Design a protein around this nucleic acid. Structure first.
Length: 14
RNA sequence: GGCAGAUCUGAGCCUGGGAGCUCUCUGCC
């Protein structure tokens, strides 16, 4: 899946 | 353990600036 950290979208696992 | 989902609660640190190294949350089983 994806999460939003430091305004960026990024891939955490599935 | 399994699955769902958010920085719209969050965060350590980098041989960073990311399909990074990851810890944590809260929903259900």
């Amino acid at each position: 899946r994806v999460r939003t950290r430091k305004g960026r979208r990024i891939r955490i696992x599935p």
